[PDB]
Ligand binder design. Structure first.
Ligand SMILES: [Zn+2]
Length: 46
């Protein structure tokens, strides 16, 4: 939901590691250049 999203906030957004754009936490992929975040998959945690 990029167009009007009261639920999610803009401060939580992320910067594309390729094109450097502001994409919402969901989905974790640039809606412009189509690039997934660098750290999305939950690794082994203790
Ligand atoms: Zn991008």
């Amino acid at each position: 939901s990029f167009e009007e999203d009261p639920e999610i906030s803009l401060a939580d957004y992320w910067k594309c590691t390729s094109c450097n754009e502001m994409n919402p936490p969901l989905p974790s992929h640039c809606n412009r250049c189509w690039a997934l975040r660098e750290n999305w998959l939950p690794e082994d945690k203790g």
